[PDB]
Amino acid sequence: MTTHDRVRLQLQALEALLREHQHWRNDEPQPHQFNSTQPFFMDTMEPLEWLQWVLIPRMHDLLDNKQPLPGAFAVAPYYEMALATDHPQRALILAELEKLDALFADDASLEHHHHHH
């Protein structure tokens, strides 16, 4: 089973979580949100609107383009602070995050098989 494909499923697992706990956001391609060019768009909007709409579809294309997974990609430690402790059910989201991050920390070395030696 394709590694880049399983991470796609993970993205859909997070999507499913946002489907049950309906907090899904749909932006009408506002360039203002991206032309800030921040890693997490912290000042452009709430750090929560980075996880969905941006991260999920962004990774969809990345996975498809056979691109190697960022070895130190970890958003769980970020949202651990970005998402207040006042909502204990955040563990559900964090578990999905730590699981996602665990996939980026899973595939470390993609073999470079050239077309000819």
mmCIF file of C-alpha atoms in Angstrom, residues 4 65-69 107-117:
data_model
loop_
_atom_site.group_PDB
_atom_site.id
_atom_site.type_symbol
_atom_site.label_atom_id
_atom_site.label_comp_id
_atom_site.label_asym_id
_atom_site.label_seq_id
_atom_site.Cartn_x
_atom_site.Cartn_y
_atom_site.Cartn_z
ATOM 1 C CA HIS A 4 1.677 8.733 0.307
ATOM 2 C CA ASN A 65 3.544 14.531 -6.461
ATOM 3 C CA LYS A 66 5.603 11.774 -4.813
ATOM 4 C CA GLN A 67 7.206 14.467 -2.649
ATOM 5 C CA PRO A 68 9.157 13.265 0.421
ATOM 6 C CA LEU A 69 7.489 13.826 3.776
ATOM 7 C CA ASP A 107 8.750 7.594 6.149
ATOM 8 C CA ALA A 108 12.257 8.957 6.531
ATOM 9 C CA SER A 109 14.124 7.774 3.460
ATOM 10 C CA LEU A 110 12.446 7.602 0.079
ATOM 11 C CA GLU A 111 14.685 5.510 -2.174
ATOM 12 C CA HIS A 112 16.031 7.416 -5.154
ATOM 13 C CA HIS A 113 15.628 4.905 -7.950
ATOM 14 C CA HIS A 114 16.999 6.555 -11.074
ATOM 15 C CA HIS A 115 15.906 5.604 -14.583
ATOM 16 C CA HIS A 116 19.383 4.324 -15.409
ATOM 17 C CA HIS A 117 22.585 3.594 -13.495
#
